[PDB]
Structures are given as C-alpha cells and as structure tokens.
Amino acid sequence: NANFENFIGATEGFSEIAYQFTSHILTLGYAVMLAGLLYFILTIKNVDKKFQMSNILSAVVMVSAFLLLYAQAQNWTSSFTFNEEVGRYFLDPSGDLFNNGYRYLNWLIDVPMLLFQILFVVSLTTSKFSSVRNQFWFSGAMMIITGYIGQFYEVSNLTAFLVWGAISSAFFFHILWVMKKVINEGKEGISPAGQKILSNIWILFLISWTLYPGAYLMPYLTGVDGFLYSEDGVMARQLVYTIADVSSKVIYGVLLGNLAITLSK
Ligand SMILES: *C/C=C(C)/C=C/C=C(C)/C=C/C1=C(C)CCCC1(C)C
C-alpha cells in the first residue's frame, strides 16, 4: 500500500540504526500498553463506583492499543529485510508490506473512548451529556476517516494528502473546542486540587493529540528535498506517534484516575 515507509524502504532503504531504532520504539509502545492494561485493571478498586467506567474505558483502550501496536510492530520488522551488498534494509517483495491500517484502526476505536471516558469523572454544568458525547463521537470518527482517506495520497498526490489533512484538522479543531468546554465545566464546584489535575489534563490532551497531525506531516516539514523527507522522517514520525500514544492513552488515563480519587474525597 503506497505509503512513505514503503517509498523510502523501496528506494533509499533503511540504515541498520533507523530500522533497529524504529523497531524498538514500536515494541516499547505495545509493551507500555500492556503494563498500562495491568495497572488500570489492578487499580480499578481505588476509585468510587461512580467513576469506574473511566477506568474500564482505559483498560479497553489498553487492550485495543496493545493488540494493534503489537501487530504494527511485527508488520514493521516483517516488511523490510537486510541486503548484504548495500548493507541496508529494503522493502521485501516476499513480505506483506508496511500497513498504516493497524494504527488508523486503533485511532478509530480509541479516539471515541478516550473522549467519552472523561464524561464519567467530571460533571458538566450547563451542557448535556448526550450532546457532548455525540459531538465527540461524530467529529472523532470523521477526523480519523478523513485522515485515513488522505494517507492514501501521501506519496501519490501530496496536494490531496494535505487537503484531506486539513479537513481532518477542522474536525480535530471541533473536538478541542468541546473538550475545552467539558474541562471548564468540570472545574466548577470541585476542590482546587481537582481543578489542578483538570488543568494538567487539558495541557496533556492539547499537546499529546497535536503530536499526531505533527507526525502525520513529519516527512514534509522540511519540504520535498528536506532532511526529514527520508528514513529520518520515518524515524521521527514513529517516535512521535509512540510518544503521543503513551501520553494520550496511558498518562491521560492515569490523570483521570487521580482526578476521580480527589472527587471521592
Ligand atoms: C489513542 C490515539 C489517538 C488519541 C489518536 C489521535 C489521532 C489524531 C488526533 C489524529 C489527528 C489527525 C489530524 C488532526 C490531521 C491529520 C490526520 C490525523 C488523523 C493524524
């Protein structure tokens, strides 16, 4: 499937470093998700019943993430193979080829649940649960779908690639706007400690989620002839994605659990 990983792998190839590093950073990804899974399971008892749906959604996200990131990892290593002559790893015809599908599926599943789960920890004031939920779920699904559409043109048609990226961005923008409202309403009438944690959650959410569109554009951030437009851009992209995954899923989940506990007090 015509993507950048495959482009680079089929033309320049990947240095030992780029291929080993990338492989290791992916393994950390799914490793951390597994640890996260066990954490959210074990600690579920630490929060009042009325918050436990958040912990549950954390656990489920962990399952999803671990399975698909693990599959992704195996895909990476399988797709590229070493050539003694040039001393680099090249896209392997006997392999399945690298597939972004695993990640974009993970997003499709995880995005709704991550947005949903905060609604079980914080209380809204003037907004309706059902309104916020539907707005999250819709825009979350649209954002990933348009992104996925765009990813097809990454190499083929960099114009459409960006256009769909921008449409995706629009939906992203809508999500941020709703989450801002949720968090602000969540703060009213809770302890300053809780407000502290909600402030932190916002920042983590804002940064961690923005990493994704960053890694999506990563290869072209230096132009077509740029440094990033290479195995290094693949390296960077996958690193950032992995940093975003851990942040947006595990750390996000941890913080919500901590918020829940202060609200039990
Ligand atoms: C746990 C996985 C998460 C939270 C994935 C989130 C993914 C995004 C917020 C993706 C955003 C994108 C854009 C805003 C434009 C470019 C295409 C995407 C999908 C990377």
Side-chain angles (χ1 to χ4, degrees), residues 107 110-111 114 143-144 147 165 168-169 172 209 212-213 216 248-249:
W107 295 351
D110 285 6
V111 157
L114 288 167
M143 156 176 86
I144 294 315
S168 180
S169 279
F172 175 52
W209 277 56
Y212 282 112
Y216 169 94
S248 77
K249 289 173 223 286

Side-chain angles (χ1 to χ4, degrees), residues 91-127 129-167:
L91 188 57
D92 186 341
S94 71
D96 290 347
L97 308 190
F98 187 66
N99 201 329
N100 279 318
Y102 298 108
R103 200 168 269 281
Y104 274 79
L105 180 54
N106 171 55
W107 295 351
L108 186 67
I109 289 166
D110 285 6
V111 157
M113 289 194 293
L114 288 167
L115 294 174
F116 192 32
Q117 70 176 122
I118 190 166
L119 297 183
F120 290 93
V121 179
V122 312
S123 295
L124 301 172
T125 57
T126 55
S127 286
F129 179 86
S130 48
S131 311
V132 163
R133 186 201 57 227
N134 296 342
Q135 284 206 96
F136 273 154
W137 282 6
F138 175 71
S139 285
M142 281 315 296
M143 156 176 86
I144 294 315
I145 276 161
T146 43
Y148 186 63
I149 282 170
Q151 187 256 163
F152 268 113
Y153 299 107
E154 187 186 8
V155 199
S156 151
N157 185 344
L158 168 148
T159 282
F161 166 74
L162 289 180
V163 159
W164 282 113
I167 295 172

Side-chain angles (χ1 to χ4, degrees), residues 18 48 70 107 136 153 199 208:
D48 276 0
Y70 176 91
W107 295 351
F136 273 154
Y153 299 107
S199 290
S208 60

Side-chain angles (χ1 to χ4, degrees), residues 189-195 197-224 226-246:
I190 71 170
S191 76
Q195 299 180 8
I197 297 173
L198 262 177
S199 290
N200 283 157
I201 283 166
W202 169 243
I203 297 166
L204 170 69
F205 183 82
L206 178 53
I207 294 171
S208 60
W209 277 56
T210 298
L211 286 192
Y212 282 112
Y216 169 94
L217 293 162
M218 182 68 70
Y220 310 83
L221 289 184
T222 58
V224 161
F227 165 65
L228 278 189
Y229 190 94
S230 68
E231 75 171 24
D232 294 294
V234 171
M235 213 167 331
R237 165 180 277 185
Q238 289 302 331
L239 169 63
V240 166
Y241 272 155
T242 304
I243 288 173
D245 290 329
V246 170

